[PDB]
Write a protein that binds this ligand. Sequence first.
Ligand SMILES: Cc1c(O)c(CN)c(COP(=O)(O)O)c[n+]1C
Ligand SMILES: Cc1c(O)c(CN)c(COP(=O)(O)O)c[n+]1C
Lengths: 396, 396
Amino acid sequence: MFENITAAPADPILGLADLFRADERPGKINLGIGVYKDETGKTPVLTSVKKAEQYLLENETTKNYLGIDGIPEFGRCTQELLFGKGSALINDKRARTAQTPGGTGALRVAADFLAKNTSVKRVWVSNPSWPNHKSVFNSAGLEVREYAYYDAENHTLDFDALINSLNEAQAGDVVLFHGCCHNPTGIDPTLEQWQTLAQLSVEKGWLPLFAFAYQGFARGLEEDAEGLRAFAAMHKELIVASSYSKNFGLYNERVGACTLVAADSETVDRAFSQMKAAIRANYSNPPAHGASVVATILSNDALRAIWEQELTDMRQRIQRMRQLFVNTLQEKGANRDFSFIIKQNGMFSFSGLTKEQVLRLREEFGVYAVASGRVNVAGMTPDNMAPLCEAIVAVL
Amino acid sequence: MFENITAAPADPILGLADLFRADERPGKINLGIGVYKDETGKTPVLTSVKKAEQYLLENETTKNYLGIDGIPEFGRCTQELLFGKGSALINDKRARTAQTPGGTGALRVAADFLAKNTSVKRVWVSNPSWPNHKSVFNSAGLEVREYAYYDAENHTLDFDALINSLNEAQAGDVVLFHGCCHNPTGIDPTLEQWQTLAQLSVEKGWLPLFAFAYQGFARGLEEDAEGLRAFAAMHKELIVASSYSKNFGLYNERVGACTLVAADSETVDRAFSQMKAAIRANYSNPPAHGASVVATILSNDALRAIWEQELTDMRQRIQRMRQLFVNTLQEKGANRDFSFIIKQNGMFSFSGLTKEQVLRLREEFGVYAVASGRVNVAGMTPDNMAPLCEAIVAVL
Ligand SMILES: Cc1c(O)c(CN)c(COP(=O)(O)O)c[n+]1C
Ligand SMILES: Cc1c(O)c(CN)c(COP(=O)(O)O)c[n+]1C
């Protein structure tokens, strides 16, 4: 019976969204979005994926079920993207990929797989992290500890406080790393940090879990995988949960992958069978469409060139807006160094605004940002950059 | 670390499939399939859904995320299909639907919702049932008890043994009913049985969970919902997990719904928020494509008429094959009453073959059936009906 079921709390971004769409004043700016937007303020479906969908509409003959792990070409392509085209990981066939419902679905089936097939009980998540990670790991029954990350002062990666809290993590604990475009701070380890982290991870026996949602948004496709690759070269095991939601603009088709690396193929196959069991008891087998679109873009040279170009344009649009944000702020006139905004990667960064300030922003100007001061740079267009900077100036 | 991870067992149908596709003799028949096939032996994508996909390819402008519960028109249409177009359930707005990854995904999020938000610990599943139900409920942490169902003698619904084991079920236990086309026996309660079951369910305080995977395959769309409707009229609460995988032939697009009925809207909304939380921590929000195809077929009269006709042809093809199976058996010549095959609904029935017999069938003739003697009637075509009957005759 359900009469004393407690309502679910407000989830941050979600609530803000309809609070936004209640504001009678169309001068309003929703910087709390979380999805990419172009200079029009729209989230278009990529030309390459439109081409790949006319193609599938022309060529699918059955909608019969995929295998639990999804379409194989999709798996193989996510492994080259992740590990690099000649990776020993791929040649020794130490990695296995399950196509999953989104990068979140990949984290939930890594979560269940691990919860029921191993000794891990703790997952270390950065402070702060994308908030839904916690919920996923706890629904699985694992507990989430947090490690320090952000220097809420220098606006950088507090590497010391990070290895310092990581030292409470024991062997066989999972430490989640964001592979590139750290949500929420857009602050990422440099390759030298990633490498000493790879080294301290094998030292302390950490099980790395890479949450890789924005490959291609920080510097480029390979560059962004350079951290995971520094880890993978040194680890016998690691798990990576990737998403194609932002970077192929396929948010609602739920396209992502959970990759298992194990020491050798014999072990990766035996753990993967239990990862398949976990998927079976969850949604049985994955959605073919968005993944079918990713596998035919990535395996066609014409189409993958057009996609790449569409992704580097996304990536460059966000890089012009971090710069144009810093300039229109340092010209609508206040004192700050917002220069840290230029250093950070991907769509998000903490502007360093207080809740009293972001609330002010929202009531007095109609600029909507998450209570953490996390601003999504892609909701900025050259047209709204000056009302937005004005507003931020006026509340500083 | 994963080196002593135990491999996952063989799942029945799955294993049989590639054992099938290893048989060098193309006279072979796979009756273990589980998906619909036409007279060609193929699982086509429906004309209506092809039309609905050219339409979506023409009209989608964004692949931005759906809400946790999916596309609303889809929810509204599954509720009319389930509860009937003028249901008080819908008018009083006591029902809430979450679009989910398949009917299995609906069972897993009913499972988690219930496991973490209520007092239920036991779920009663028929003996036998579709085997993945157990796994879903256990991954959620609920335990599965079984109630008797099939009379492995008279080839019917042993109604007595059914209410007799159901009496060990306590109040607040979930009893899962298959709404129509009982997998695996194709044996369904008659409306009089459904009604005394509705009555004994409210008597003992059972929480009904309808697994509704084959609406439209037994007699017709409304007829098939008549059991659920006998229950819904009498229950303050019930959950129904439906799938559009067979009946729209959208297996791999993972299209299904989890509907919550509660006493009133205030309560249904508050339990639904926690069902949304469960989805959030699982795959965040559902795949739009297959559901977007179901919502535009169902809301367009031209397209929904073509779909209906395509579903009644599926349904009639399976009904010709149950009859043609019984005749070609009662003419390839052995003694039995296979007449119970005609009484049963949907794609499956237990032929009443022994494991020693289905194994024989498989080694000596290359007819592949599940070890339970469950035969999928849709894998029978008028062309393979006589090798198949011959084989079954020769092993009786
Ligand atoms: C790290 C991570 C983040 O941060 C997000 C979004 N903030 C997602 C979302 O992926 P999706 O494919 O939409 O489920 C996944 N992952 C794995
Ligand atoms: C009762 C039930 C059965 O029996 C099956 C298949 N045997 C399914 C499969 O639905 P899907 O939409 O493919 O996950 C669901 N349900 C809810």
